[PDB]
Amino acid sequence: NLYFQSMSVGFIGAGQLAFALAKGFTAAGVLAAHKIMASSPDMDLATVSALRKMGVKLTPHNKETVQHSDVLFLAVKPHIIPFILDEIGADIEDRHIVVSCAAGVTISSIEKKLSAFRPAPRVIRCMTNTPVVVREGATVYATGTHAQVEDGRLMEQLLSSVGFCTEVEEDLIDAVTGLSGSGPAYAFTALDALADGGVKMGLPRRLAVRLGAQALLGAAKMLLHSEQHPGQLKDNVSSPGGATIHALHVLESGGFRSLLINAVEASCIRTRELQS
Amino acid sequence: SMSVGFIGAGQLAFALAKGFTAAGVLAAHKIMASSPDMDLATVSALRKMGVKLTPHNKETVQHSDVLFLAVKPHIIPFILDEIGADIEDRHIVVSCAAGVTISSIEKKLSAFRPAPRVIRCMTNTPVVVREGATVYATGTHAQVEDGRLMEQLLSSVGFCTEVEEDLIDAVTGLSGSGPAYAFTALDALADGGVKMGLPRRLAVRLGAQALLGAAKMLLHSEQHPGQLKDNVSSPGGATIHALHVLESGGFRSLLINAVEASCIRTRELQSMAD
Amino acid sequence: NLYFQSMSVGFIGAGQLAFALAKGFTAAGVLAAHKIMASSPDMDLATVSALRKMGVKLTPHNKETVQHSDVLFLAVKPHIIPFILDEIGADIEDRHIVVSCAAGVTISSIEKKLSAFRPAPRVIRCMTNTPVVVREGATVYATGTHAQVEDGRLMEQLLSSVGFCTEVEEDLIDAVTGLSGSGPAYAFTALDALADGGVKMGLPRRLAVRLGAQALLGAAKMLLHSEQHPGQLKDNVSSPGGATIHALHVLESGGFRSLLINAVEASCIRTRELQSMA
Amino acid sequence: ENLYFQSMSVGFIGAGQLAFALAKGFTAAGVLAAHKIMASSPDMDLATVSALRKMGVKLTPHNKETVQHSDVLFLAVKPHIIPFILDEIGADIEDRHIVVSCAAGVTISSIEKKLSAFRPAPRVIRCMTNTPVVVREGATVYATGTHAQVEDGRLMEQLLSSVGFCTEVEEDLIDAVTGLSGSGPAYAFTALDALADGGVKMGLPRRLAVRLGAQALLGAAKMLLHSEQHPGQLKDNVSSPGGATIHALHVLESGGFRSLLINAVEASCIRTRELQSMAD
Numbered sequence A: 001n002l003y004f005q006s007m008s009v010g011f012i013g014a015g016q017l018a019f020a021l022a023k024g025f026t027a028a029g030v031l032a033a034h035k036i037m038a039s040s041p042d043m044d045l046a047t048v049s050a051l052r053k054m055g056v057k058l059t060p061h062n063k064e065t066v067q068h069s070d071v072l073f074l075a076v077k078p079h080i081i082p083f084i085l086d087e088i089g090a091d092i093e094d095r096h097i098v099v100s101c102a103a104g105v106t107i108s109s110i111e112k113k114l115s116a117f118r119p120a121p122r123v124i125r126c127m128t129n130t131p132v133v134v135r136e137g138a139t140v141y142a143t144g145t146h147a148q149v150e151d152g153r154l155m156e157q158l159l160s161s162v163g164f165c166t167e168v169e170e171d172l173i174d175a176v177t178g179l180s181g182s183g184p185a186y187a188f189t190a191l192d193a194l195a196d197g198g199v200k201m202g203l204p205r206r207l208a209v210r211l212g213a214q215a216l217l218g219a220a221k222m223l224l225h226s227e228q229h230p231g232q233l234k235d236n237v238s239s240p241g242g243a244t245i246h247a248l249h250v251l252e253s254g255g256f257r258s259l260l261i262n263a264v265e266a267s268c269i270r271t272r273e274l275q276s
Numbered sequence B: 001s002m003s004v005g006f007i008g009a010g011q012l013a014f015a016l017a018k019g020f021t022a023a024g025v026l027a028a029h030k031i032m033a034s035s036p037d038m039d040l041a042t043v044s045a046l047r048k049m050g051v052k053l054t055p056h057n058k059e060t061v062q063h064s065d066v067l068f069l070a071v072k073p074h075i076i077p078f079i080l081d082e083i084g085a086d087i088e089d090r091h092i093v094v095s096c097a098a099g100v101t102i103s104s105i106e107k108k109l110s111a112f113r114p115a116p117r118v119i120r121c122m123t124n125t126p127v128v129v130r131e132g133a134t135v136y137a138t139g140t141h142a143q144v145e146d147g148r149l150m151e152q153l154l155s156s157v158g159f160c161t162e163v164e165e166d167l168i169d170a171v172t173g174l175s176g177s178g179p180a181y182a183f184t185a186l187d188a189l190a191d192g193g194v195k196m197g198l199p200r201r202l203a204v205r206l207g208a209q210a211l212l213g214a215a216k217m218l219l220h221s222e223q224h225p226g227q228l229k230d231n232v233s234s235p236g237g238a239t240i241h242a243l244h245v246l247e248s249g250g251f252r253s254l255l256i257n258a259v260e261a262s263c264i265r266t267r268e269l270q271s272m273a274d
Numbered sequence C: 001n002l003y004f005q006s007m008s009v010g011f012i013g014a015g016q017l018a019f020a021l022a023k024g025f026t027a028a029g030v031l032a033a034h035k036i037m038a039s040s041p042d043m044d045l046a047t048v049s050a051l052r053k054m055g056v057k058l059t060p061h062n063k064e065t066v067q068h069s070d071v072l073f074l075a076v077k078p079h080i081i082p083f084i085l086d087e088i089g090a091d092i093e094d095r096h097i098v099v100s101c102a103a104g105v106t107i108s109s110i111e112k113k114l115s116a117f118r119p120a121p122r123v124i125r126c127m128t129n130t131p132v133v134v135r136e137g138a139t140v141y142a143t144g145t146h147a148q149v150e151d152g153r154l155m156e157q158l159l160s161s162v163g164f165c166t167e168v169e170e171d172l173i174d175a176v177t178g179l180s181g182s183g184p185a186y187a188f189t190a191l192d193a194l195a196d197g198g199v200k201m202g203l204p205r206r207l208a209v210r211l212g213a214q215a216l217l218g219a220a221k222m223l224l225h226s227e228q229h230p231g232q233l234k235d236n237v238s239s240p241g242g243a244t245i246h247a248l249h250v251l252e253s254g255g256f257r258s259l260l261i262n263a264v265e266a267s268c269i270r271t272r273e274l275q276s277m278a
Numbered sequence D: 001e002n003l004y005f006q007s008m009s010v011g012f013i014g015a016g017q018l019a020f021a022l023a024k025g026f027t028a029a030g031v032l033a034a035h036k037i038m039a040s041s042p043d044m045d046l047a048t049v050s051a052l053r054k055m056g057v058k059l060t061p062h063n064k065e066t067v068q069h070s071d072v073l074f075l076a077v078k079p080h081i082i083p084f085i086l087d088e089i090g091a092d093i094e095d096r097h098i099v100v101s102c103a104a105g106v107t108i109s110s111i112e113k114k115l116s117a118f119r120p121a122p123r124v125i126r127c128m129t130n131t132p133v134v135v136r137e138g139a140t141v142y143a144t145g146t147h148a149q150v151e152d153g154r155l156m157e158q159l160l161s162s163v164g165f166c167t168e169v170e171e172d173l174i175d176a177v178t179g180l181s182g183s184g185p186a187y188a189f190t191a192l193d194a195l196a197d198g199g200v201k202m203g204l205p206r207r208l209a210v211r212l213g214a215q216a217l218l219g220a221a222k223m224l225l226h227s228e229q230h231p232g233q234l235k236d237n238v239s240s241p242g243g244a245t246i247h248a249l250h251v252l253e254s255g256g257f258r259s260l261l262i263n264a265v266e267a268s269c270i271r272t273r274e275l276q277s278m279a280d
Ligand SMILES: O=C(O)[C@H]1C[C@@H]1c1ccccn1
Pocket: C237, C238, C239, C242, C243, C244, C245, D018, D102, D103, D104, D128, D129, D130, D131, D178, D182, D183
């Protein structure tokens, strides 16, 4: 409570992630909308329109966002980050916690750019995902060289208000991107395809969408609340000779498992490329 | 207020009882379940919950008003023969067995007493965490209050809606078998996380939380799942690269294949029952 | 009601793209054909005979095109561009706007070449496609170092008369090449195959070509005029259990989607190699 | 224009996607007043029904009211509902009606068999159209039934041409048309979503990639319709030696791109034939 009581948050970038976080934070009750500020070069964006309706102060100047924020989220594409650290770098102060959300961008790279201005910049690296908008995000963070003990603690409480959150070593964050960072996109693909199959077999599309989504939600919650291995839960619900085991067979015949492994791998490797 | 019985005491009976009593809609002590093999792990878990257990299907009928049939589909004919003479005006018979049509249940129960009140439903195991997906069709002699009662009960443990009976085999392929597709996906995503360096326990948690939040996002937006995929794929980024490798494998067609195969197998099991 | 009275346009090159643009510009009414000049080392091309019928002035000499023109389109193969710039570089004046349509050729390389002759050449890079010929092209452009503000607005005005036109950062043009630059060829291949499919199921070839093209035209127009996701429009057409969803499944089973992603990717990456061969 | 002053009353049995697309197209074309259209559905909770309401279309749950209102009556329900529909309103079909069946696969013979038990000479037309009529760029074929007057086919062609291409065919081509242009817009929506994904993968904003892909497909289709040339010739004309386009065409060929579209037309046509055989 005392963490967020006298806390101001700014977003460099008013894109998809910034709206999701701002929307998650306000819905959780941790931050008030008017106490949040975002800067965007293009105010013609859709997210920039939705954020204004929320009551989020918007500005074109990143230097304005830096001046009126304590915790500063960097929610821009990785290639813009060094151009932004050169723009607002002289405005970073001792009180700023800089939370980097750009994929791939290492703590070392941010600290190197900001250490040329003030010596001990407090930096945290973050991999979250869009379901923070419904407070069911998956977030990890690593603390940088000069982050104080309370800084990790403040970050953990804030990000926990909108989903799962835990600290990791920074070298795991590329892998987390490929799993839970890109994860929701795999799920949306899967739901579109599952609804298509429902439609093929005679269901109205709207019902097929709803039923597929409820199935995934329930199965994930079930796994999260179980002590049990995913395979054991698969085994429990697969009756001998039944419909479900017949469907699992056709998933196995297309190498379904290898495609998800391929996906996690390809997103992680792309994240490593964007750093280098 | 109401008395509920379970013929069968396996995965589905435990999942519904646990969900119902966790929802606060049923008291565990007003639930009775019957099983032949009184040594299944599910039979022990139902005891630890407060549920009254028995080996006589006839005692479960005499105890309950709402009667769930949660046995394998090939046992349903034999159960309707054993207790058919014990069904009264008061009973609502709710069949959860996959494929088993309302017609076949009504024909068997009508030889003992006309106008049996029958409901067919397709549900799934996540009712155990109150996040099931349930559809139901009302039989010939189900009164209106029967279907409204069933929707109130089953809504307390997940999504529930009424459908025409000829959709239920498709629903089986989609949300009936759906959780198993998700467990397969979660096992594979976790293997991917581990290959890229994550501890298994962390990778299982992150993969499960991702699927949960994605599903909730879609349930709470007006938006097409393709649109949400568009919203989360930045140009040139890690996600769109991973989506490409899913597409190159025909990821979408495999899930369509799955729904189709489960629905078709469901229809075969009803046919061999005819 | 657009018309550029004080503007004279020249094309260096007289192949597919120069004809398509000149045909589009003259059909749109924005340019009289006699105010357009084109040059080609092969004055016996099929497109060259077509341009002469429209009334377009033709000449073998690239210096003549430059000396007659204000807006100068470079509509030649990418590896021809450096030799062109060597040839006409000393003829470029302050009045010239050089619009390069060559795939992959960067603004930087054109400006470096032309700056040897006269400082501050006004350069615009353009990625367009052949449907400008029926005034339904897809065009993006990026403005160069010394291109004035009035230069980009002028090119957007002209290119908008023959289809969609918008300004982009130069580093998106390779990717636009992969999508809308090469896109019409993907569509032609698709329409050939769809027609084959109609013929297999018993349609006359002429009807099947007509119906397939009309289907693609109407679907693209639906998407352009709708605020909706293409997945949602797909959803509205597929009746439960119906013929369409059965066909979508066999598309999905062959990985239809990934092949189009593969295509955009391959065209873009090849475009980058040609920009590095420069 | 000449059709508008005919002051035709039009009915749709079914108020789904195709009924909305056609009603929207006819009203945009100015050939029909929205309030001169009546549509019926057993489910008034459909989004298409609410859109129809907003347009000014008359809505009723009673198919008989739609029939009594109509001069030209469109059957736009799923193919397996048609026989139940003809049983219900067959007695209300009058000599003045033109019955236009849009149901995929449903033959003129089966409709005439049902309706002829009531009046002797039902005027029946079978048509295959598609959802781009909503932007007046539909693809429509129709076949005239046993008792359709020569004027009935001409009126149909006039009406359907106001919302896109329209031509008369023998009925035995209509299953194949269904697999090509009936299902075709969905093949294109899939292609456009994928092409956009490819644009985004190579660095384009989604909004721009969607716009460019759609514009490309529209321009290419128009090019072909206005050309007297083979699609392969247009492909040849635009693929420069060693260029980016010919490289991309190779990777399409290596995945069997052409065969997937042939497979699709075939599968939709074959499914359409099964929807009729399951009826009969
Ligand atoms: O829904 C489908 O699968 C399409 C085959 C049917 C259709 C009917 C009428 C007009 C256009 N398409």
